[PDB]
UniProtKB/Swiss-Prot annotation:
Annotated function: Key regulator of striated muscle performance by acting as the major Ca(2+) ATPase responsible for the reuptake of cytosolic Ca(2+) into the sarcoplasmic reticulum. Catalyzes the hydrolysis of ATP coupled with the translocation of calcium from the cytosol to the sarcoplasmic reticulum lumen. Contributes to calcium sequestration involved in muscular excitation/contraction.
Matches recorded under Gene3D superfamilies: Calcium-transporting ATPase, cytoplasmic domain N, Calcium-transporting ATPase, cytoplasmic transduction domain A, Calcium-transporting ATPase, transmembrane domain, HAD superfamily/HAD-like
Protein name in UniProt: Sarcoplasmic/endoplasmic reticulum calcium ATPase 1
GO biological process, one term: positive regulation of ATPase-coupled calcium transmembrane transporter activity
Variant or mutagenesis effect after changing residue 876 to A: Loss of ATP-dependent Ca(2+)transport
Lumenal side stretches: 70-89, 274-295, 778-787, 852-897, 950-964
Keyword field: ATP-binding, Calcium, Calcium transport, Disulfide bond, Endoplasmic reticulum, Ion transport, Magnesium, Membrane, Metal-binding, Nucleotide-binding, Phosphoprotein, Sarcoplasmic reticulum, Translocase, Transmembrane, Transmembrane helix, Transport
Amino acid sequence: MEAAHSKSTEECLAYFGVSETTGLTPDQVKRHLEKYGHNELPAEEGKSLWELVIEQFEDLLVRILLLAACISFVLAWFEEGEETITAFVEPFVILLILIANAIVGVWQERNAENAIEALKEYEPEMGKVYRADRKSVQRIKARDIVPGDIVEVAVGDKVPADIRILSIKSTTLRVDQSILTGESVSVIKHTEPVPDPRAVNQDKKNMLFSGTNIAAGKALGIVATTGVSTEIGKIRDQMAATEQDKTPLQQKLDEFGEQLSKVISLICVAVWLINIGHFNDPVHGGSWIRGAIYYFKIAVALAVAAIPEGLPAVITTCLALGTRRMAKKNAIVRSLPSVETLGCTSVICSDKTGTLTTNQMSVCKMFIIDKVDGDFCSLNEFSITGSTYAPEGEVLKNDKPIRSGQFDGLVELATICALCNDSSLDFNETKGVYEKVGEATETALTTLVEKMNVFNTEVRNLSKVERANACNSVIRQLMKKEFTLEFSRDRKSMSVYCSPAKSSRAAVGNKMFVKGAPEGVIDRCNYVRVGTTRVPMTGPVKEKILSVIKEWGTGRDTLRCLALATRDTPPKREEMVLDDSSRFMEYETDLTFVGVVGMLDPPRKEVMGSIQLCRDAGIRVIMITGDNKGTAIAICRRIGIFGENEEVADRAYTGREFDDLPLAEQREACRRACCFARVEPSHKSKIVEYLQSYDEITAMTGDGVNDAPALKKAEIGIAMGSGTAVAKTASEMVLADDNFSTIVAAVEEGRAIYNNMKQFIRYLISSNVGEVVCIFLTAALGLPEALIPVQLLWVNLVTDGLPATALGFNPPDLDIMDRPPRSPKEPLISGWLFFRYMAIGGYVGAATVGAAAWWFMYAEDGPGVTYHQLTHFMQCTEDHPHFEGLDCEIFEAPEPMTMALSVLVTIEMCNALNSLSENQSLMRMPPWVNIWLLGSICLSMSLHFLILYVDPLPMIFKLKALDLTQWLMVLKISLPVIGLDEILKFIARNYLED
Ligand SMILES: Nc1ncnc2c1ncn2[C@@H]1O[C@H](COP(=O)(O)OP(=O)(O)CP(=O)(O)O)[C@@H](O)[C@H]1O
Ligand SMILES: CC(=O)C1=C(O)N2[C@H](C1=O)[C@H]1c3c[nH]c4cccc(c34)C[C@H]1C2(C)C
Ligand SMILES: [K+]
Ligand SMILES: [Mg+2]
Ligand SMILES: [Mn+2]
Ligand SMILES: [Mn+2]
């Protein structure tokens, strides 16, 4: 059944053809269960660890290193009776890396807790119905409720389905709809049509929404919809639309996967063309068994050389450490990549209530009457400080603290606030904070009474649990509450009838204390309290008081105001009927106006300063709230999203006003406007989606179930520590201490992290370039491979491993938070920078083949000088007469490859220093800046020396140690890589773009 809110109750009943005092028949229920299905949300799984690891071995690039694992496996199985001892280390070191990178890949991408399961917390197991087969209510499984059911809800119930209210049995039905609005103040419901077809949930005052709850009262309704066709079901579906997105760089990674996987395929057929180059002269002395095996040997060496294994490890380590830093600021990152994603953020969308604000309703202004001089009427206004339910703050007069008990009118105001009240305050010993018990707007009065302390009660030595209601209890000892005239919609006030406690002295006679909406309470006042005296309420006085109250309700203030009054001479108890709320208004007449309190849900102290720092970093903040527009704008002004006098006609929209714009204008509104109010959970994700469609990297901050869709949709969702479990499980990061400042800190950390990542990725990839150049040089020319996979794997994983991780510890810049966010489209290399280490890469790729082949010809030991014969080792077994004065095995010596490896290691270690900075020469930026880079290289070097000098190590890696002349040759053939890039820095800091 659609449009339940605009149908009358008779139309809803007639739709299902049911009586309100009968309900559906059990057969009808059976048919509706068939037709509509059960009243429940589908569970959303999320793949076993099985189908996750499987997906790690799916993206193209990973297969390349699996191909070179299986080929490596075969070309190590059918190994001759020679070294089948360690031939299997290669297909295992590889096969190990692919295992390690998978387990890590899942340990960062997997979201443990499920947000749809948290949502189901709002699904009550049980609901209550009237069905035709019984007169009395029937308590059944909620999932068995169907459209058409007559349902009964009552105080404390979770609402089981979307329900048109038919009949309110209590005097009011008060509903907490925070899961759809973020707002915890009760909604007073009625049963009349809401004619607007586009009514937003905050308008549907005749509906009950599944998953909300009844703060008070009792009602009967008819179920309009169940299952996913409900408001909470819509939230569930937007969370189920699981896009499983990815960090900008993580999309660059996924991108570079496609990049490198083709580069290899092209290079492999390119090696093949130069392998097929001397295919026209193989003299068939070794058939093709040698040829088709030497070629795969090359492929495994090329694939290994191209793929920068260890990169997944250095990143994960960088991210993980980042997460450790944020944890010390009380930011719990639940997804590793997210710690960095925040750095690229250009727009931060924010819930207001409980996010920007404390979600703790606070009386911040009050007044009583000081004097009435005929027509003129002087008010005594006070402000009250403090922004939580904690009874901490003071009452101020002209910004100076005063003792509330000084003023008789405040004693009376406090008395009414304490007594005309169904709530209290409680100190939660487990959470360490004060919490309301009952309605927010009532607990605000309770908190006020505690701050006012009109009797100067000693409260400093109380435990926090006792302190919670101390000053209210002292008022209870004076006046005894005898009964309550509860709130009704017709009069918009409530009152309590009180007698002075035994042993009076206070004052003789019974009293009625009244609070309510200003206009109706004031209309029923014939007198005004001035101190302890009472004077006639006149027109001009009534007008002055109403005017000030109206200013308080619409200002830069926009406060909820209550008027407080007492009936000085109440009827005798016996003259009042309590079972009929229609009579209550009349009982609350001939009142004496006492005062007014104005409350709001106020900003967290750090929010204003945080918005400013965001603004200084080129980040826009947009408030997106379920709350009304007036309040939303007023808070925006207090927190500096808008200027205090800024005109916001086209900068602030309700969800409806936003919906009314042409689709094009809706997109532009999202760039111009900074406050969206009276919004549904869908509006928030819609706005985030528009923002993202300008390619803005966008964040969402929230605490509520109604923020869950936007939290999921945003690149980065951020939840408040004290907010809902649903919002937390929908987020990438949680601010455990609710400190909004931490977001600003997380952006800086994320920018620092991004800078270090991009450059340690360059450092690690400049390496993989030279290797490929090498594995191609010593292949095309017909040379004995200067490096083989098992050595390359050590370098990429370990030798370059440490230094890369060292660069992820470089100091962040000083202006890091004074630049605008970087563009998401920004590559990782551009023009100058690409050819920059294609030059450095052209050097390592040559100097390695160049120092290995050096050991042949122009070196001492030194088989050696063969020249053109070196580029023809395939015919030493066959065409031996050519190779006279030499053996036919010394072409497979460990020394020349040790020369090659020692060059690579030495070049990359130097290449780590020039990686400390992008443009600043080592002259102007010392190599002693990042000490941890020094310890990192000295480790890599001492590890290099190791595999050269430990009995097993050089056999598994095919190395043989170098003389001190074999190292002088290495240094004089590697160290120039510094001066090369160093001059590449001089030709970039001046004549390029500096
Ligand atoms: N328990 C209570 N005792 C006294 N006064 C109460 C009260 N609960 C609410 N009120 C007062 O009466 C008014 C009744 O609220 P109501 O149901 O009219 O909603 P609202 O006017 O705040 C709704 P909306 O923002 O959706 O238009 C409140 O604004 C408040 O001043
Ligand atoms: C088994 C497993 O999950 C993985 C791997 O085994 N790896 C990475 C990877 O994710 C591979 C990868 C994909 N996209 C990129 C971009 C840059 C670098 C890497 C990758 C390293 C790749 C490899 C093969 C080490
Ligand atoms: K998200
Ligand atoms: Mg909220
Ligand atoms: Mn992977
Ligand atoms: Mn109302």
